[PDB]
From a paper:
However, successful blotting of sponge phase was demonstrated, offering new possibilities for handling and background reduction for sponge-phase samples. Blotting of the sponge phase was successful on the silanized chips; as shown by investigation of the background signal. However, the procedure for sponge-phase blotting still requires substantial improvements and is not yet suitable for crystals that exist in both the cubic and sponge phase, which is a common occurrence in LCP crystallization trials. When a surfactant is present, i.e. for lipid- or detergent-containing crystallization buffers, the wetting on the polymer film is usually sufficient.
To assess the quality of structures that can be obtained from chip-mounted crystals, diffraction data were collected from a range of proteins. These proteins included the insulin, thaumatin and HEWL that were used in initial tests, and also TD1, a tubulin–DARPin D1 complex, EcR2a, a class Ia ribo­nucleotide reductase radical-generating subunit, rhodopsin–miniGo and PepTst, a bacterial peptide transporter.
Author numbering: 5 to 270, 275 to 405, 423 to 478
Write the structure that this text describes.
Amino acid sequence: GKTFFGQPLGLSTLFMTEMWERFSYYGMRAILLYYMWFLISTGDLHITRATAASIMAIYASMVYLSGTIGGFVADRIIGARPAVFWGGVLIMLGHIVLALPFGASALFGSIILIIIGTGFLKPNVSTLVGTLYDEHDRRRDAGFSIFVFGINLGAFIAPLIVGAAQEAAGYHVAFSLAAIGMFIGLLVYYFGGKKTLDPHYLRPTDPLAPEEVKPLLVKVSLAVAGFIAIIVVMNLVGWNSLPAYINLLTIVAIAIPVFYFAWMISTSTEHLRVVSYIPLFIAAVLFWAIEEQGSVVLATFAAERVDSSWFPVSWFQSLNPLFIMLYTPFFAWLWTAWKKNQPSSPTKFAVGLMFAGLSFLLMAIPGALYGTSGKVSPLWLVGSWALVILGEMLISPMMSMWFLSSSVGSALNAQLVTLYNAKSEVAYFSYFGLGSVVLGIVLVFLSKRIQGL
Ligand SMILES: CCCCCCC/C=C/CCCCCC(=O)OC[C@@H](O)CO
Ligand SMILES: CCCCCCC/C=C\CCCCCC(=O)OC[C@@H](O)CO
Ligand SMILES: CCCCCCC/C=C\CCCCCC(=O)OC[C@@H](O)CO
Ligand SMILES: CCCCCCC/C=C\CCCCCC(=O)OC[C@@H](O)CO
Ligand SMILES: CCCCCCC/C=C\CCCCCC(=O)OC[C@@H](O)CO
Ligand SMILES: CCCCCCC/C=C\CCCCCC(=O)OC[C@@H](O)CO
Ligand SMILES: CCCCCCC/C=C\CCCCCC(=O)OC[C@@H](O)CO
Ligand SMILES: CCCCCCC/C=C\CCCCCC(=O)OC[C@@H](O)CO
Ligand SMILES: CCCCCCC/C=C\CCCCCC(=O)OC[C@@H](O)CO
Ligand SMILES: CCCCCCC/C=C\CCCCCC(=O)OC[C@@H](O)CO
Ligand SMILES: CCCCCCC/C=C\CCCCCC(=O)OC[C@@H](O)CO
Ligand SMILES: CCCCCCC/C=C\CCCCCC(=O)OC[C@@H](O)CO
Ligand SMILES: CCCCCCC/C=C\CCCCCC(=O)OC[C@@H](O)CO
Ligand SMILES: CCCCCCC/C=C\CCCCCC(=O)OC[C@@H](O)CO
Ligand SMILES: CCCCCCC/C=C\CCCCCC(=O)OC[C@@H](O)CO
Ligand SMILES: CCCCCCC/C=C\CCCCCC(=O)OC[C@@H](O)CO
Ligand SMILES: CCCCCCC/C=C\CCCCCC(=O)OC[C@@H](O)CO
Ligand SMILES: CCCCCCC/C=C\CCCCCC(=O)OC[C@@H](O)CO
Ligand SMILES: CCCCCCC/C=C\CCCCCC(=O)OC[C@@H](O)CO
């Protein structure tokens, strides 16, 4: 019967809903760093380029950290379907803010809107995907992979369309197209959802019991009061610069897993098996750090060290989702072909880290051989994104912990990307790439012990 690639027809609605949100997100991130460079060059934004690179990282870290709670707010308060809609509305307004004839004053407002909007929409669209499949249904893994292709499809075409629009009609026009991209998703999601989506998800599936509202309000109130108390203390002692606030969000993002892990210990049944997660989680952190630097460090390398005089330099951001779109058909073949091998999930996380380390190690070669004073070939970045996406495919298959590793890895980037420049290029690439490889080699021994557990 009628399907969307063998799947329920509701997938096409959610497939396009997320493609257009990812089009709006990754089209914005493809030019946002260059937009901050431009505001710096005109004197409107009084920060260094190292700070702007750190802003891009802590931006992504907060976006994925905000996704760790959107599932809770939907499942318990507002509902999954209203969360996606109003989440996209906030995402749309965030891109409209950057389209207004403002400058650096509109950066923080746009960032807050997209952080909150993505937190509402991003996890709940995937939740609504699994609601098309009953728990017995076996097309789940096939349906989510189709869903991933739509994530990367919009992520691939966004820098091409938005980047070219920036170099032709300017930034404000380019950011408006990102808002239009989200608006297109809202139209298809609203009217398309009303036809094929279960109305049971217009409301929370686990609404708060009467006795649960007060302790939750206390819990939220104490967290906001403490976070505000820290900001007050910082301004009293003089720690009030923008890098100081970035350091605060970095500590907060990293303190969440280490506190959620330190007291997860207290039952020897899985007391050691809880520990087995740690090497897999920390490996996921360092990989997402390497992977998310493509929009920061590799975006900086493309703009300064590559002869890209015949196309917009923001198009290099399409290499990350392009290789995924190419690897997916091969990788679908691979996992069902080598059924007898069955690579253990721990072992995969090193190969993903080794590949990520290889991608940076490769990028240390052009500067060591030709120097950093000139321009190199664009195929260095093509070969670099070819290796890191290779590792992403291996690590590709609660999502909040998944959101958390990306947030911690991106929070780690908020500190490291400030070390990158033309004079530190070779050492930065070589040492962070070498250290990531040797930390993939230590996994072999640690995987064996996790295999035993
Ligand atoms: C999506 C971005 C990927 C771009 C990959 C480009 C692969 C290019 C390979 C050849 C090296 C650059 C050649 C420069 C070039 O031919 O310029 C033409 C001439 O006008 C001199 O600038
Ligand atoms: C005006 C600025 C507001 C910006 C809002 C950004 C809020 C981002 C994150 C808040 C939620 C942090 C709590 C995350 C958490 O503990 O969940 C992790 C847990 O689910 C692991 O599975
Ligand atoms: C209008 C205010 C901004 C939009 C409201 C949503 C702000 C995000 C979070 C508010 C706190 C909700 C509680 C989150 C929470 O308890 O997460 C628990 C965690 O275990 C999730 O699994
Ligand atoms: C700047 C935009 C302001 C908001 C304009 C749109 C508000 C107009 C009507 C409210 C529609 C709320 C729909 C919420 C919802 O859950 O939609 C889910 C979708 O699947 C349709 O059921
Ligand atoms: C419980 C709260 C968890 C912490 C979440 C707070 C995250 C809020 C905002 C993060 C925005 C990152 C910094 C944005 C920024 O620096 O841009 C403004 C700057 O351009 C103005 O000069
Ligand atoms: C459909 C509702 C949400 C979609 C966004 C709607 C608004 C999008 C575009 C309207 C025009 C954008 C403004 C373009 C602009 O002002 O920049 C050009 C000019 O300022 C620089 O020379
Ligand atoms: C300055 C540019 C305009 C700024 C405001 C743009 C807001 C325009 C339209 C609101 C979009 C609402 C979401 C789109 C949608 O599908 O809504 C359908 C629903 O509201 C119909 O009941
Ligand atoms: C940072 C500002 C956040 C503003 C919104 C955060 C709200 C967080 C916790 C309070 C949630 C109370 C919702 C009560 C509710 O809707 O359920 C009531 C009913 O189901 C109980 O019988
Ligand atoms: C629940 C216990 C609360 C005790 C305080 C918790 C937070 C402790 C320190 C937060 C420091 C914020 C980031 C450090 C900082 O501001 O560095 C400033 C430096 O970069 C120059 O301004
Ligand atoms: C008893 C709890 C376990 C033991 C405490 C573990 C430490 C807990 C939180 C610290 C978070 C890591 C520090 C954040 C970080 O590495 O960046 C520091 C930097 O941003 C300051 O400028
Ligand atoms: C198969 C893809 C992986 C290829 C990467 C393997 C190459 C490993 C390391 C190459 C970087 C060497 C760094 C050379 C170096 O730093 O020398 C110092 C001086 O020459 C440059 O400042
Ligand atoms: C899983 C498959 C991985 C296969 C990767 C094989 C790549 C082997 C070597 C690549 C090292 C980088 C190439 C260095 C190089 O050719 O520099 C010279 C270049 O300028 C030629 O003009
Ligand atoms: C199988 C992968 C191909 C081989 C990868 C190993 C490449 C190792 C180093 C990168 C090329 C070395 C660049 C020359 C160099 O670093 O020395 C320069 C320095 O001596 C000048 O003072
Ligand atoms: C699985 C893929 C592994 C990637 C293998 C590593 C290859 C990476 C870069 C090769 C650099 C070749 C650059 C030489 C070239 O063709 O362009 C010449 C240059 O002078 C034009 O600008
Ligand atoms: C069947 C899949 C095998 C893929 C693994 C091989 C990786 C793909 C390309 C590696 C290219 C090696 C670098 C080529 C090179 O050294 O530059 C050649 C250049 O000097 C010719 O002008
Ligand atoms: C199990 C949780 C995993 C935690 C992974 C994060 C590792 C903990 C702390 C990393 C701190 C990185 C500090 C970077 C640094 O100090 O150098 C950069 C600095 O100069 C920026 O101004
Ligand atoms: C020699 C250390 C054990 C080798 C383990 C295998 C690691 C994978 C590839 C070798 C990477 C060599 C990196 C060379 C390097 O880091 O040079 C640093 C350079 O800045 C100082 O000249
Ligand atoms: C075990 C968890 C590891 C997670 C954190 C790994 C990195 C931690 C700290 C790195 C900051 C120290 C910077 C060392 C350094 O000199 O690198 C900069 C150099 O490459 C350019 O000058
Ligand atoms: C400068 C030398 C560069 C090349 C060295 C890289 C390869 C050398 C050693 C890698 C494997 C070390 C032994 C790992 C091992 O088999 O331990 C047992 C482990 O498999 C148990 O799970």
